[PDB]
mmCIF file of C-alpha atoms in Angstrom:
data_model
loop_
_atom_site.group_PDB
_atom_site.id
_atom_site.type_symbol
_atom_site.label_atom_id
_atom_site.label_comp_id
_atom_site.label_asym_id
_atom_site.label_seq_id
_atom_site.Cartn_x
_atom_site.Cartn_y
_atom_site.Cartn_z
ATOM 1 C CA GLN A 1 73.634 84.641 123.889
ATOM 2 C CA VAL A 2 74.469 84.466 120.285
ATOM 3 C CA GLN A 3 78.292 84.345 118.975
ATOM 4 C CA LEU A 4 80.125 83.424 116.093
ATOM 5 C CA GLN A 5 83.369 81.805 115.322
ATOM 6 C CA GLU A 6 85.118 80.926 112.259
ATOM 7 C CA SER A 7 87.353 78.269 111.061
ATOM 8 C CA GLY A 8 89.932 78.677 108.089
ATOM 9 C CA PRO A 9 93.415 77.392 106.968
ATOM 10 C CA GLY A 10 95.335 80.124 107.209
ATOM 11 C CA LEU A 11 97.692 79.878 103.981
ATOM 12 C CA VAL A 12 96.596 78.820 100.861
ATOM 13 C CA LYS A 13 98.525 78.066 97.461
ATOM 14 C CA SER A 14 97.125 80.260 94.602
ATOM 15 C CA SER A 15 94.176 79.025 91.974
ATOM 16 C CA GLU A 16 93.432 76.264 94.552
ATOM 17 C CA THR A 17 89.627 76.718 96.252
ATOM 18 C CA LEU A 18 89.482 78.541 99.459
ATOM 19 C CA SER A 19 86.898 77.061 102.079
ATOM 20 C CA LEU A 20 86.126 78.621 105.003
ATOM 21 C CA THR A 21 83.570 77.848 108.078
ATOM 22 C CA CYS A 22 81.653 79.276 110.738
ATOM 23 C CA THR A 23 79.848 78.316 113.729
ATOM 24 C CA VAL A 24 76.941 79.646 115.909
ATOM 25 C CA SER A 25 76.723 79.128 119.664
ATOM 26 C CA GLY A 26 73.195 78.337 120.778
ATOM 27 C CA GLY A 27 70.258 79.861 119.064
ATOM 28 C CA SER A 28 68.985 77.979 115.989
ATOM 29 C CA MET A 29 69.418 79.518 112.210
ATOM 30 C CA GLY A 30 66.440 81.572 112.816
ATOM 31 C CA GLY A 31 65.815 84.977 111.528
ATOM 32 C CA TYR A 32 69.330 85.810 110.675
ATOM 33 C CA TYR A 33 71.142 86.220 107.252
ATOM 34 C CA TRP A 34 74.653 84.544 107.373
ATOM 35 C CA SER A 35 76.965 86.804 106.133
ATOM 36 C CA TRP A 36 80.535 86.621 104.730
ATOM 37 C CA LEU A 37 82.641 89.573 104.753
ATOM 38 C CA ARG A 38 86.750 90.423 104.145
ATOM 39 C CA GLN A 39 89.234 93.313 105.169
ATOM 40 C CA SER A 40 92.265 94.402 103.995
ATOM 41 C CA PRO A 41 94.111 97.464 103.175
ATOM 42 C CA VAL A 42 94.132 98.308 99.595
ATOM 43 C CA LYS A 43 90.888 96.663 99.054
ATOM 44 C CA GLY A 44 89.616 97.796 102.158
ATOM 45 C CA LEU A 45 86.502 96.254 103.664
ATOM 46 C CA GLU A 46 83.926 94.489 101.620
ATOM 47 C CA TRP A 47 80.777 92.110 101.714
ATOM 48 C CA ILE A 48 81.094 89.043 100.355
ATOM 49 C CA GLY A 49 77.585 87.366 100.567
ATOM 50 C CA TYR A 50 74.974 86.371 102.876
ATOM 51 C CA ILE A 51 72.795 82.880 103.072
ATOM 52 C CA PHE A 52 69.254 82.481 104.525
ATOM 53 C CA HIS A 53 68.118 78.722 106.443
ATOM 54 C CA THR A 54 65.863 77.878 103.505
ATOM 55 C CA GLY A 55 69.203 77.980 100.925
ATOM 56 C CA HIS A 56 68.323 81.686 99.613
ATOM 57 C CA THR A 57 71.831 83.327 98.403
ATOM 58 C CA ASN A 58 72.491 86.906 98.050
ATOM 59 C CA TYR A 59 76.370 87.383 96.819
ATOM 60 C CA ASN A 60 78.462 90.683 95.830
ATOM 61 C CA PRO A 61 77.970 90.722 92.077
ATOM 62 C CA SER A 62 81.947 91.631 91.443
ATOM 63 C CA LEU A 63 82.839 88.219 92.918
ATOM 64 C CA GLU A 64 79.261 86.282 92.387
ATOM 65 C CA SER A 65 80.906 84.323 89.759
ATOM 66 C CA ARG A 66 83.538 82.961 92.406
ATOM 67 C CA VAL A 67 81.546 82.691 95.296
ATOM 68 C CA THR A 68 79.585 79.692 96.758
ATOM 69 C CA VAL A 69 77.779 79.945 100.159
ATOM 70 C CA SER A 70 76.163 77.038 101.878
ATOM 71 C CA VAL A 71 74.291 76.181 105.185
ATOM 72 C CA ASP A 72 74.304 73.145 107.673
ATOM 73 C CA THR A 73 71.306 73.696 109.888
ATOM 74 C CA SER A 74 71.670 70.393 111.278
ATOM 75 C CA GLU A 75 75.355 70.739 112.676
ATOM 76 C CA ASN A 76 74.683 74.677 113.048
ATOM 77 C CA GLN A 77 77.332 76.044 110.669
ATOM 78 C CA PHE A 78 77.219 77.955 107.395
ATOM 79 C CA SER A 79 80.333 77.361 104.934
ATOM 80 C CA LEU A 80 81.982 79.550 102.218
ATOM 81 C CA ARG A 81 83.795 78.690 98.983
ATOM 82 C CA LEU A 82 85.570 80.817 96.737
ATOM 83 C CA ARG A 83 87.403 79.164 93.599
ATOM 84 C CA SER A 84 90.560 80.192 91.977
ATOM 85 C CA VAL A 85 92.241 82.402 94.467
ATOM 86 C CA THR A 86 94.859 84.795 94.150
ATOM 87 C CA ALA A 87 97.297 86.878 96.385
ATOM 88 C CA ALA A 88 94.429 89.524 95.810
ATOM 89 C CA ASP A 89 92.315 87.640 97.850
ATOM 90 C CA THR A 90 94.591 87.629 100.908
ATOM 91 C CA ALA A 91 92.563 89.463 103.790
ATOM 92 C CA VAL A 92 91.471 88.768 107.015
ATOM 93 C CA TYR A 93 87.367 87.138 106.553
ATOM 94 C CA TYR A 94 84.772 87.609 108.736
ATOM 95 C CA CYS A 95 81.501 85.814 109.595
ATOM 96 C CA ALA A 96 78.819 87.764 110.921
ATOM 97 C CA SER A 97 74.873 88.154 111.112
ATOM 98 C CA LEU A 98 71.897 90.283 109.633
ATOM 99 C CA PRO A 99 68.582 90.271 110.808
ATOM 100 C CA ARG A 100 65.817 89.075 108.817
ATOM 101 C CA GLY A 101 63.773 91.224 106.867
ATOM 102 C CA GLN A 102 64.380 95.327 105.809
ATOM 103 C CA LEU A 103 67.602 95.912 104.668
ATOM 104 C CA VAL A 104 68.012 99.491 104.206
ATOM 105 C CA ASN A 105 68.848 100.271 107.554
ATOM 106 C CA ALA A 106 70.390 96.794 108.481
ATOM 107 C CA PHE A 107 74.118 96.633 109.907
ATOM 108 C CA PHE A 108 75.763 93.268 110.259
ATOM 109 C CA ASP A 109 76.014 92.191 114.041
ATOM 110 C CA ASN A 110 78.088 89.397 116.178
ATOM 111 C CA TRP A 111 80.836 89.415 114.142
ATOM 112 C CA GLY A 112 83.734 86.577 114.504
ATOM 113 C CA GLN A 113 87.327 87.114 115.124
ATOM 114 C CA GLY A 114 88.286 86.304 112.350
ATOM 115 C CA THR A 115 90.605 84.591 109.798
ATOM 116 C CA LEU A 116 93.515 85.703 108.266
ATOM 117 C CA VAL A 117 93.720 83.835 104.958
ATOM 118 C CA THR A 118 96.987 84.292 103.098
ATOM 119 C CA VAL A 119 97.222 83.275 99.412
ATOM 120 C CA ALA A 120 100.473 83.004 97.878
ATOM 121 C CA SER A 121 102.482 80.550 95.501
ATOM 122 C CA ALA A 122 102.017 77.136 95.002
ATOM 123 C CA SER A 123 105.790 76.473 94.553
ATOM 124 C CA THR A 124 109.032 77.588 96.965
ATOM 125 C CA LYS A 125 111.157 79.575 94.946
ATOM 126 C CA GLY A 126 114.939 81.602 95.414
ATOM 127 C CA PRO A 127 114.820 85.143 95.486
ATOM 128 C CA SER A 128 116.760 87.357 92.996
ATOM 129 C CA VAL A 129 118.976 90.165 94.147
ATOM 130 C CA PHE A 130 119.978 93.241 92.658
ATOM 131 C CA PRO A 131 122.242 96.170 93.463
ATOM 132 C CA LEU A 132 120.496 99.788 94.998
ATOM 133 C CA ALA A 133 123.429 101.893 93.731
ATOM 134 C CA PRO A 134 123.403 105.143 95.279
ATOM 135 C CA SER A 135 123.943 108.770 94.544
ATOM 136 C CA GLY A 142 127.363 113.789 104.741
ATOM 137 C CA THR A 143 125.658 110.574 104.020
ATOM 138 C CA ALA A 144 124.627 108.392 101.368
ATOM 139 C CA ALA A 145 122.112 105.317 101.230
ATOM 140 C CA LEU A 146 122.619 102.462 98.978
ATOM 141 C CA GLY A 147 120.537 98.979 99.085
ATOM 142 C CA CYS A 148 119.947 95.751 98.035
ATOM 143 C CA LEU A 149 116.987 94.184 96.813
ATOM 144 C CA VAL A 150 115.512 90.708 96.981
ATOM 145 C CA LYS A 151 112.860 90.207 94.562
ATOM 146 C CA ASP A 152 110.451 87.355 93.669
ATOM 147 C CA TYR A 153 110.851 84.776 96.686
ATOM 148 C CA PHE A 154 108.720 82.085 98.763
ATOM 149 C CA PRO A 155 108.312 81.384 101.597
ATOM 150 C CA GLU A 156 109.180 83.735 103.980
ATOM 151 C CA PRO A 157 111.781 84.398 105.805
ATOM 152 C CA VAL A 158 114.766 85.473 104.418
ATOM 153 C CA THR A 159 117.652 87.289 106.503
ATOM 154 C CA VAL A 160 119.790 89.625 104.961
ATOM 155 C CA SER A 161 123.273 90.643 106.248
ATOM 156 C CA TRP A 162 125.915 93.100 105.260
ATOM 157 C CA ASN A 163 129.459 92.030 104.550
ATOM 158 C CA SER A 164 129.078 88.816 106.557
ATOM 159 C CA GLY A 165 127.864 90.882 109.188
ATOM 160 C CA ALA A 166 131.105 93.115 109.788
ATOM 161 C CA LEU A 167 128.963 95.926 108.305
ATOM 162 C CA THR A 168 126.064 96.340 111.136
ATOM 163 C CA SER A 169 125.515 100.367 111.765
ATOM 164 C CA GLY A 170 123.072 102.390 109.809
ATOM 165 C CA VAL A 171 121.429 99.081 108.403
ATOM 166 C CA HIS A 172 117.893 98.472 108.005
ATOM 167 C CA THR A 173 116.010 95.616 106.778
ATOM 168 C CA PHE A 174 112.050 96.723 105.807
ATOM 169 C CA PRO A 175 109.549 93.978 105.870
ATOM 170 C CA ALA A 176 108.314 92.595 102.710
ATOM 171 C CA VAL A 177 105.390 92.918 100.162
ATOM 172 C CA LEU A 178 103.129 89.856 99.422
ATOM 173 C CA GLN A 179 103.003 90.875 95.523
ATOM 174 C CA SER A 180 100.060 89.780 93.132
ATOM 175 C CA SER A 181 102.634 87.095 92.072
ATOM 176 C CA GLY A 182 101.958 85.200 95.245
ATOM 177 C CA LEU A 183 105.873 86.159 96.454
ATOM 178 C CA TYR A 184 107.388 88.297 98.631
ATOM 179 C CA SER A 185 109.949 90.867 97.970
ATOM 180 C CA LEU A 186 111.848 93.303 100.903
ATOM 181 C CA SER A 187 114.838 95.807 100.657
ATOM 182 C CA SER A 188 117.494 96.044 102.875
ATOM 183 C CA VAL A 189 119.315 99.571 102.869
ATOM 184 C CA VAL A 190 122.444 100.613 104.267
ATOM 185 C CA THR A 191 123.656 104.456 104.735
ATOM 186 C CA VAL A 192 127.320 105.283 104.943
ATOM 187 C CA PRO A 193 129.640 107.535 104.579
ATOM 188 C CA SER A 194 129.980 109.808 101.098
ATOM 189 C CA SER A 195 133.482 109.954 102.286
ATOM 190 C CA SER A 196 133.497 106.370 101.395
ATOM 191 C CA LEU A 197 132.719 104.678 97.947
ATOM 192 C CA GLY A 198 135.519 103.973 95.864
ATOM 193 C CA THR A 199 137.182 102.524 99.149
ATOM 194 C CA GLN A 200 135.437 100.287 101.332
ATOM 195 C CA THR A 201 133.201 97.875 99.154
ATOM 196 C CA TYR A 202 129.716 96.792 100.426
ATOM 197 C CA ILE A 203 128.453 93.647 99.815
ATOM 198 C CA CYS A 204 124.835 92.180 100.386
ATOM 199 C CA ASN A 205 124.457 88.785 101.533
ATOM 200 C CA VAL A 206 121.059 87.180 101.179
ATOM 201 C CA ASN A 207 119.890 83.930 102.597
ATOM 202 C CA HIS A 208 116.927 81.972 101.815
ATOM 203 C CA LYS A 209 117.087 78.935 103.841
ATOM 204 C CA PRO A 210 113.587 77.184 102.195
ATOM 205 C CA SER A 211 115.115 77.119 98.847
ATOM 206 C CA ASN A 212 119.137 76.437 99.857
ATOM 207 C CA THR A 213 119.533 79.773 98.138
ATOM 208 C CA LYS A 214 122.214 81.951 99.251
ATOM 209 C CA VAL A 215 123.469 85.251 97.185
ATOM 210 C CA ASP A 216 126.453 87.294 97.801
ATOM 211 C CA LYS A 217 126.545 90.726 95.822
ATOM 212 C CA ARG A 218 128.707 93.776 95.274
ATOM 213 C CA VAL A 219 126.744 97.154 95.372
ATOM 214 C CA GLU A 220 128.714 100.314 94.070
ATOM 215 C CA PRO A 221 127.673 103.423 92.109
ATOM 216 C CA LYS A 222 127.457 103.639 87.950
ATOM 217 C CA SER A 223 128.988 106.303 85.905
ATOM 218 C CA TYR B 2 83.234 101.505 94.733
ATOM 219 C CA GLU B 3 83.714 102.444 98.515
ATOM 220 C CA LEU B 4 82.511 106.253 98.754
ATOM 221 C CA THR B 5 85.053 108.349 100.316
ATOM 222 C CA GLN B 6 86.280 108.743 103.746
ATOM 223 C CA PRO B 7 90.225 109.929 104.622
ATOM 224 C CA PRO B 8 92.862 107.516 105.241
ATOM 225 C CA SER B 9 94.349 108.786 108.555
ATOM 226 C CA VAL B 10 92.608 110.982 110.796
ATOM 227 C CA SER B 11 94.849 111.078 114.266
ATOM 228 C CA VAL B 12 94.357 113.112 116.980
ATOM 229 C CA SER B 13 96.117 113.355 120.830
ATOM 230 C CA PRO B 14 94.503 111.540 123.772
ATOM 231 C CA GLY B 15 91.256 113.187 124.509
ATOM 232 C CA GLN B 16 90.909 115.648 121.440
ATOM 233 C CA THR B 17 88.032 115.063 119.168
ATOM 234 C CA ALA B 18 88.317 113.120 116.442
ATOM 235 C CA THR B 19 85.983 113.242 113.013
ATOM 236 C CA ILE B 20 85.558 110.797 110.017
ATOM 237 C CA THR B 21 83.653 111.787 107.121
ATOM 238 C CA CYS B 22 81.704 109.020 104.983
ATOM 239 C CA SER B 23 81.142 111.180 101.612
ATOM 240 C CA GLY B 24 80.315 109.973 98.285
ATOM 241 C CA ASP B 25 76.595 110.704 96.536
ATOM 242 C CA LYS B 26 74.791 107.900 97.699
ATOM 243 C CA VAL B 27 74.875 109.432 100.849
ATOM 244 C CA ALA B 28 71.450 111.212 100.724
ATOM 245 C CA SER B 29 69.185 108.503 99.625
ATOM 246 C CA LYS B 30 70.162 105.834 102.303
ATOM 247 C CA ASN B 31 71.387 105.970 105.934
ATOM 248 C CA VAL B 32 75.072 105.208 106.943
ATOM 249 C CA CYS B 33 76.357 103.024 109.450
ATOM 250 C CA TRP B 34 79.506 102.826 111.097
ATOM 251 C CA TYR B 35 82.155 99.877 112.450
ATOM 252 C CA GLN B 36 85.077 99.870 114.141
ATOM 253 C CA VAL B 37 87.662 97.066 113.466
ATOM 254 C CA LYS B 38 90.611 95.895 115.509
ATOM 255 C CA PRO B 39 93.132 92.982 115.107
ATOM 256 C CA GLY B 40 92.591 89.659 116.791
ATOM 257 C CA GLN B 41 89.305 91.346 118.043
ATOM 258 C CA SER B 42 85.854 90.914 116.507
ATOM 259 C CA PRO B 43 84.621 94.159 114.894
ATOM 260 C CA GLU B 44 81.419 95.826 116.404
ATOM 261 C CA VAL B 45 79.000 98.624 115.271
ATOM 262 C CA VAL B 46 79.908 101.921 116.742
ATOM 263 C CA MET B 47 77.106 103.257 114.844
ATOM 264 C CA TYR B 48 73.688 102.942 113.003
ATOM 265 C CA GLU B 49 71.083 105.176 111.170
ATOM 266 C CA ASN B 50 73.266 107.889 111.071
ATOM 267 C CA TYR B 51 72.953 108.911 114.883
ATOM 268 C CA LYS B 52 71.984 105.918 117.038
ATOM 269 C CA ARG B 53 73.543 104.549 119.319
ATOM 270 C CA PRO B 54 74.135 100.853 120.122
ATOM 271 C CA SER B 55 74.302 98.999 123.342
ATOM 272 C CA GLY B 56 77.228 99.165 125.562
ATOM 273 C CA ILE B 57 78.755 101.836 123.154
ATOM 274 C CA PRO B 58 80.286 104.937 124.590
ATOM 275 C CA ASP B 59 78.444 107.857 124.865
ATOM 276 C CA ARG B 60 81.592 109.834 123.843
ATOM 277 C CA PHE B 61 81.305 108.633 120.293
ATOM 278 C CA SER B 62 78.944 111.105 118.261
ATOM 279 C CA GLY B 63 77.353 110.517 115.195
ATOM 280 C CA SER B 64 75.616 112.717 112.496
ATOM 281 C CA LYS B 65 74.948 113.362 108.617
ATOM 282 C CA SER B 66 74.460 116.481 106.663
ATOM 283 C CA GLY B 67 73.634 117.139 102.886
ATOM 284 C CA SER B 68 75.845 114.345 101.043
ATOM 285 C CA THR B 69 78.262 113.834 103.894
ATOM 286 C CA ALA B 70 78.111 111.342 107.302
ATOM 287 C CA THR B 71 80.383 111.752 110.204
ATOM 288 C CA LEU B 72 81.539 109.948 113.259
ATOM 289 C CA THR B 73 82.835 111.738 116.040
ATOM 290 C CA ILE B 74 84.632 110.193 118.888
ATOM 291 C CA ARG B 75 84.631 113.367 121.345
ATOM 292 C CA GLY B 76 87.576 112.746 123.638
ATOM 293 C CA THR B 77 89.302 110.126 122.250
ATOM 294 C CA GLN B 78 90.819 107.209 123.980
ATOM 295 C CA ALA B 79 93.542 104.734 122.884
ATOM 296 C CA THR B 80 91.167 102.073 122.943
ATOM 297 C CA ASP B 81 89.175 103.909 120.154
ATOM 298 C CA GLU B 82 92.125 103.573 117.677
ATOM 299 C CA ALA B 83 91.191 101.470 114.772
ATOM 300 C CA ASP B 84 89.711 101.148 111.543
ATOM 301 C CA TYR B 85 86.542 102.761 111.161
ATOM 302 C CA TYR B 86 84.352 101.657 107.773
ATOM 303 C CA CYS B 87 80.938 103.524 106.768
ATOM 304 C CA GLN B 88 78.066 101.114 105.393
ATOM 305 C CA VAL B 89 75.525 102.105 103.132
ATOM 306 C CA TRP B 90 72.723 100.013 101.773
ATOM 307 C CA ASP B 91 72.438 99.389 97.826
ATOM 308 C CA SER B 92 69.942 98.188 95.496
ATOM 309 C CA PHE B 93 72.336 96.004 93.600
ATOM 310 C CA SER B 94 75.942 95.852 95.466
ATOM 311 C CA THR B 95 73.289 95.212 97.953
ATOM 312 C CA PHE B 96 75.784 96.895 100.330
ATOM 313 C CA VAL B 97 78.861 99.581 99.954
ATOM 314 C CA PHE B 98 81.256 99.943 102.577
ATOM 315 C CA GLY B 99 83.810 103.129 102.722
ATOM 316 C CA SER B 100 87.798 103.607 101.691
ATOM 317 C CA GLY B 101 88.465 103.012 105.426
ATOM 318 C CA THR B 102 89.834 105.609 108.083
ATOM 319 C CA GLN B 103 92.366 104.636 110.416
ATOM 320 C CA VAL B 104 92.144 106.406 113.573
ATOM 321 C CA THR B 105 95.353 106.758 115.331
ATOM 322 C CA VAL B 106 95.449 108.131 119.015
ATOM 323 C CA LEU B 107 99.034 109.630 120.048
ATOM 324 C CA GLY B 108 101.460 108.317 121.400
ATOM 325 C CA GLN B 109 104.778 109.872 121.062
ATOM 326 C CA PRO B 110 106.494 113.171 119.404
ATOM 327 C CA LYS B 111 104.926 113.077 115.606
ATOM 328 C CA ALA B 112 107.995 112.207 112.880
ATOM 329 C CA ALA B 113 108.170 113.184 109.636
ATOM 330 C CA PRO B 114 109.119 110.328 107.147
ATOM 331 C CA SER B 115 112.583 110.136 105.984
ATOM 332 C CA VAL B 116 112.199 108.734 102.044
ATOM 333 C CA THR B 117 114.640 107.333 99.541
ATOM 334 C CA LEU B 118 113.801 106.316 96.128
ATOM 335 C CA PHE B 119 116.133 103.910 94.204
ATOM 336 C CA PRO B 120 115.903 103.415 89.959
ATOM 337 C CA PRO B 121 115.855 100.369 88.406
ATOM 338 C CA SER B 122 119.301 98.638 88.407
ATOM 339 C CA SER B 123 121.204 97.910 85.278
ATOM 340 C CA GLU B 124 121.214 93.815 85.855
ATOM 341 C CA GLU B 125 117.877 94.064 86.344
ATOM 342 C CA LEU B 126 117.499 95.854 83.236
ATOM 343 C CA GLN B 127 119.604 93.012 81.097
ATOM 344 C CA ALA B 128 117.144 90.850 82.721
ATOM 345 C CA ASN B 129 114.335 92.896 81.107
ATOM 346 C CA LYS B 130 112.357 93.603 84.609
ATOM 347 C CA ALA B 131 112.153 96.945 86.027
ATOM 348 C CA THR B 132 111.640 98.186 89.774
ATOM 349 C CA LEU B 133 111.514 101.420 91.846
ATOM 350 C CA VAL B 134 111.771 101.493 95.559
ATOM 351 C CA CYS B 135 110.338 103.929 97.214
ATOM 352 C CA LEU B 136 111.711 103.407 101.096
ATOM 353 C CA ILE B 137 109.930 105.480 103.934
ATOM 354 C CA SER B 138 111.239 105.037 107.531
ATOM 355 C CA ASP B 139 111.346 106.893 110.962
ATOM 356 C CA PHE B 140 107.524 108.474 110.689
ATOM 357 C CA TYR B 141 104.919 108.408 113.451
ATOM 358 C CA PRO B 142 102.079 107.968 113.346
ATOM 359 C CA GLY B 143 102.393 104.917 111.380
ATOM 360 C CA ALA B 144 99.939 106.198 108.629
ATOM 361 C CA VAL B 145 101.468 107.095 105.446
ATOM 362 C CA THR B 146 99.718 107.407 101.909
ATOM 363 C CA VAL B 147 101.984 106.602 98.745
ATOM 364 C CA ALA B 148 100.971 107.927 95.574
ATOM 365 C CA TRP B 149 103.755 107.117 92.091
ATOM 366 C CA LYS B 150 104.162 109.665 89.237
ATOM 367 C CA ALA B 151 105.041 109.073 85.955
ATOM 368 C CA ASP B 152 106.770 112.401 84.507
ATOM 369 C CA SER B 153 103.998 113.752 86.510
ATOM 370 C CA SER B 154 100.315 112.075 86.387
ATOM 371 C CA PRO B 155 99.582 109.072 88.599
ATOM 372 C CA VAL B 156 100.654 105.163 87.888
ATOM 373 C CA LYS B 157 97.850 102.876 88.295
ATOM 374 C CA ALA B 158 99.272 99.216 87.937
ATOM 375 C CA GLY B 159 102.433 97.718 89.394
ATOM 376 C CA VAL B 160 102.486 99.334 92.771
ATOM 377 C CA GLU B 161 102.494 97.206 95.623
ATOM 378 C CA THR B 162 102.877 98.883 99.047
ATOM 379 C CA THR B 163 103.983 97.270 102.541
ATOM 380 C CA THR B 164 101.535 98.378 105.768
ATOM 381 C CA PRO B 165 103.537 100.387 108.106
ATOM 382 C CA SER B 166 105.513 98.340 110.458
ATOM 383 C CA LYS B 167 107.035 99.405 113.918
ATOM 384 C CA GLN B 168 110.667 99.260 114.240
ATOM 385 C CA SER B 169 113.051 99.114 117.077
ATOM 386 C CA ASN B 170 113.125 102.821 117.783
ATOM 387 C CA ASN B 171 109.243 102.710 118.537
ATOM 388 C CA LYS B 172 108.646 104.822 114.495
ATOM 389 C CA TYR B 173 107.327 103.230 111.985
ATOM 390 C CA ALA B 174 108.225 102.030 108.339
ATOM 391 C CA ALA B 175 107.215 101.278 104.856
ATOM 392 C CA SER B 176 108.035 100.716 101.549
ATOM 393 C CA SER B 177 106.657 101.064 97.880
ATOM 394 C CA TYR B 178 107.412 98.983 94.866
ATOM 395 C CA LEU B 179 106.867 100.599 91.223
ATOM 396 C CA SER B 180 107.050 97.657 88.584
ATOM 397 C CA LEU B 181 107.768 98.509 85.131
ATOM 398 C CA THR B 182 108.612 97.102 81.815
ATOM 399 C CA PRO B 183 112.440 98.671 80.402
ATOM 400 C CA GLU B 184 110.962 100.961 77.855
ATOM 401 C CA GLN B 185 108.426 102.334 80.213
ATOM 402 C CA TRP B 186 111.545 103.247 82.333
ATOM 403 C CA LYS B 187 113.682 105.469 79.716
ATOM 404 C CA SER B 188 110.159 106.496 77.832
ATOM 405 C CA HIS B 189 109.137 109.111 80.369
ATOM 406 C CA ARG B 190 111.349 112.335 81.736
ATOM 407 C CA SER B 191 111.347 111.191 84.907
ATOM 408 C CA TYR B 192 109.439 108.900 87.471
ATOM 409 C CA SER B 193 108.377 110.023 91.549
ATOM 410 C CA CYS B 194 107.170 108.526 94.798
ATOM 411 C CA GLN B 195 104.958 110.822 96.619
ATOM 412 C CA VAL B 196 104.673 109.881 100.448
ATOM 413 C CA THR B 197 102.063 112.348 102.264
ATOM 414 C CA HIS B 198 102.171 111.820 106.302
ATOM 415 C CA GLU B 199 99.647 113.970 108.183
ATOM 416 C CA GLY B 200 99.433 117.485 106.749
ATOM 417 C CA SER B 201 102.788 117.433 104.959
ATOM 418 C CA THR B 202 103.718 115.600 101.622
ATOM 419 C CA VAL B 203 107.333 115.216 100.430
ATOM 420 C CA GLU B 204 108.477 114.004 96.993
ATOM 421 C CA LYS B 205 111.619 111.786 95.752
ATOM 422 C CA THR B 206 112.466 111.948 91.817
ATOM 423 C CA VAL B 207 114.580 110.130 89.560
ATOM 424 C CA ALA B 208 115.308 109.890 86.027
ATOM 425 C CA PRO B 209 116.934 107.191 83.563
ATOM 426 C CA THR B 210 120.272 109.290 83.601
#
């Protein structure tokens, strides 16, 4: 009847310009406000902006300065440009529809899938590793910081230490970079005996890092 | 601004899940409800406070009293497990949505989170930068709020937090990084990581020795 579907790039470098498109199936660009929204954690779900077949635009004021939305009545598409993106703009973008006229009780309908957009660093970079010193088991770890892209593989003592090891998923941070931690739980009877070493391997940057972990004071 | 709704809300299957969209502006204007799931087009599950769109299960029930909107699910089922957002029209922002509510249907037996907090390292401090690592593991369901505390008063900036990821043992794991300047760390008496899962909240505390 009227189904919408959006195309996007997926991965985008920081400070470059994000351009998304949405396609309408069948019906003309009639009594509808063609809308763009986005959803994520942190920022939740927010409305980006809508546009009418005439060219009339309405944007989110907090985003109005950067946002630009367009129509192509000819091709049956409508588009979004964002201008200068950051890792905070990393979210799932949706194209949807509003009905022309009254807006007080209106809701968006005929949503898209839509398209996950990840904004990250423009350049490949190796991680920086730092020891997580411990205090009948105690836990010690390795911290890999500020790297791109994924993935990074962490092993302990060349893979000789396997038990009690848990490597957490990474965080995409405002820098457009990733960072994760890998923690092993070990006998408190240990320490001062049996050295613990974090082996970090980040292939895209030819980075390999071995780091000794042991308590201080 | 996003008015207010609880982050979590969970239920055993068939139990009744109640979500609250409250926040002042909710008196002037009518409220609708959207559900959101990954790899799937979100849909209106409510509009005009109480009205029931097409093809939407009768079990959902929607109401509004005073300055508080409410989406009730009634006999909830695994399909309903999603993120629910509350929407209200506004004159200038054109729209305002909710903080979001992650309705979770169990599932498995519940599990309290195991938390481990690591202070900034010497090597990192010598390289200026400082970072605090709060690690949360083995908890169910996958819904945890993480707040940070300088001495004992919440921290706004430099907080990054993963979304909970399922691990091999079917439980969830999440991590939270609090980024700090050197002086920042030794200045305050201590720093604290505070993770509240379901009803309970547990706290881990560290100091610059």
